[PDB]
Amino acid sequence: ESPSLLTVIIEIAPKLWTTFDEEGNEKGSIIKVLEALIVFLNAHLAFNSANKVAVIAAYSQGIKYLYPESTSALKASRSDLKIINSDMYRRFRNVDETLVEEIYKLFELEKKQIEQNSQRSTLAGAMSAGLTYVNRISKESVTTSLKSRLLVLTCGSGSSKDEIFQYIPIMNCIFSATKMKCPIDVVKIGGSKESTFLQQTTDATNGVYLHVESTEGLIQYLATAMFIDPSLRPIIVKPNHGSVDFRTSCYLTGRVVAVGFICSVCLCVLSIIPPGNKCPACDSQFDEHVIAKLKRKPVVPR
């Protein structure tokens, strides 16, 4: 009916995938997830003649657009490497060859810059870049009624824990995708069953959350549950089991918050009254009169 844009945010990190390879029995799961993604993109391009594909990779030192290529790089180029066979459909072949060429270049960049270990994950910035590209394809409006859908292929592998710095950018991406009606599906490959921020991303933006433990048979997961086109979103139910509670972590203790208190200035969530009667985030001094009422013990006769 209506063509859509599939923007793929893949989180390829050499430290993250090595942990998954060490935890799993098999090695080189990057190749498996890449070929599953390639078959899924060929499937999406087969769905409609006018659909478009965006692929952005988040590596350790930054982000880079896998597909389409940079316009400076496109003008500079074309060495047709034989990673993908040339006898297939040309529309699939161009996308696949461009994707594997940019995988080659990005892994050469990672090998060159392997000495520096980054403690800052760039998945949220990659999602923001994908949202900008989605707005560009909508704003450009070359094609009538292009729709859109983000698909984030991330890996936790039981090594990367919850990242509290990502919270505000992921929430901003949620609000942006809700504004532009872009569903966000998330595939997580790793031993961490629960990813609270990404589950909130799937739940709030009418996306599908899917956690898997083995990279084998991944195209069976993608072509079945992640193939929900934006044209057929309301008429197809979503298999995103394990509903998220939409809670948040405390600021000074870190635990998931029950009934609690927040700062009226900076909205930071506190599970308990902070010491010194001052906000730990924005350094606002609290009135001692009002916090005594919060500290006031409930009443019952003797």
Binding site: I83, I114, V299
Partner: protein
């Protein structure tokens, strides 16, 4: 004033009128306050804004205006007199209300009184129209005319007051006390008749000035400055914003309830490199029809769970009869009201009202028994 919470709580007539107006709040009141023994002050404690809104819906009044200027005819001519127009006539013109009190309950009815007043010279005088002797007026109303003039005199008795020297026009002509210049011509003087007496057109000017002064002075109720007036605010410094600025620290605590070396990292990367060099056989993505069964079972079970949850989600129709459903609804409503009062008194933190907390706990136990 009357808008304080203790005044709203003790205003029994206002609560009765709010009950009389409302219907959905009646079902909560009648089944809890008397049928379940809830104190009436406790019931209206949580509905203070509703009581304030109902009080302010009728307590407010319109501003003063020239009501007689709006009154105009339309042979038969008809004019419509609303009750609010009558009240505005009484407020703006106390002389008419004085004639209303001693005539309408005594001699003739109210529409006859208003028809006599509209055909009288008093209406023409109070409307600013010039008075002529050819009009008959009305002999009952016109008896007040001279008294009305006395009222006008008494109007000056609370209108004349000393003013500031900035707008002291009296002192401007009295700055030179012995001035004896040329007398101004008749264009600069009020008009006179053939006999030299005034034509009365100056009286209607004083009439409308008096009306404006009375409407302004009616706002003055319970409902060094020359330096500030003469200062040029444009030449002063522009206003500077004193808005507070905040710097937010992002050093939050991590969430609480096998590091790879760079050598094996590079070996795995090079393994991916050589696996990308030789052949990326996409046909390897096909499952061996065994793991695909497990994937299909997992996906179909998740779909079944989500579809059974989202099969069903103005209230929805119930299988219960309308007689039993309304009884369950009202009992749920009074249980929720008792629970709200109990939690308010429990989390208020005042030890002096702990007996009310005990009474609400007994009421909650009675609600458990009723359930």
């Amino acid at each position: 004033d009357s808008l304080s919470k203790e005044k709203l709580l003790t205003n029994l007539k206002l609560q009765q009128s709010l009950l009389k107006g409302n219907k959905v709040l009646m079902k909560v009141f009648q089944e809890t306050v008397i049928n379940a023994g809830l104190p009436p002050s406790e019931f209206w404690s949580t509905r203070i804004p509703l009581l304030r809104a109902f009080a302010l819906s009728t307590s407010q009044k319109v501003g003063p205006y020239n009501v007689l200027s709006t009154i105009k005819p339309v042979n038969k001519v008809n004019v419509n007199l609303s009750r609010e127009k009558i009240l505005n006539i009484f407020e703006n013109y106390p002389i008419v209300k004085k004639a209303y009190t001693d005539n309408v309950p005594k001699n003739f009815k109210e529409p006859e009184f208003w028809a006599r007043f509209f055909s009288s010279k008093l209406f023409r005088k109070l409307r600013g129209e010039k008075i002529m002797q050819n009009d008959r007026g009305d002999v009952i109303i016109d008896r007040y005319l001279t008294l009305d003039q006395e009222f006008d005199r008494k109007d000056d008795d609370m209108l004349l007051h000393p003013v500031k020297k900035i707008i002291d026009l009296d002192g401007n002509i009295q700055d030179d006390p012995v001035v004896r210049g040329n007398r101004p011509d008749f264009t600069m003087q009020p008009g006179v008749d053939i006999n030299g007496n005034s034509d009365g057109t100056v009286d209607i000017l004083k009439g409308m000035n008096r009306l404006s002064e009375k409407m302004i002075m009616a706002l003055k109720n319970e409902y060094n400055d020359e330096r500030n007036e003469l200062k040029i605010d444009d030449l002063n410094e522009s206003y500077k914003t004193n808005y507070a600025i905040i710097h937010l620290k992002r050093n939050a605590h991590e969430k609480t309830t096998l590091k790879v070396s760079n050598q094996q990292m590079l070996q795995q990367l090079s393994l991916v490199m050589d696996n990308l060099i030789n052949k990326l056989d996409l046909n390897q993505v096909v499952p061996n029809n065994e793991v695909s069964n497990k994937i299909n079972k997992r996906v179909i079970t998740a779909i079944k769970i989500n579809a059974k949850q989202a099969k069903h989600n103005l209230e929805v129709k119930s299988t219960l009869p309308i007689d039993l459903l309304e009884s369950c609804r009202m009992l749920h409503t009074t249980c929720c009201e008792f629970l709200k009062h109990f939690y308010i008194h429990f989390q208020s933190g005042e030890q002096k009202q702990a007996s009310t907390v005990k009474k609400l706990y007994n009421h909650l136990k009675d609600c458990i028994e009723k359930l």
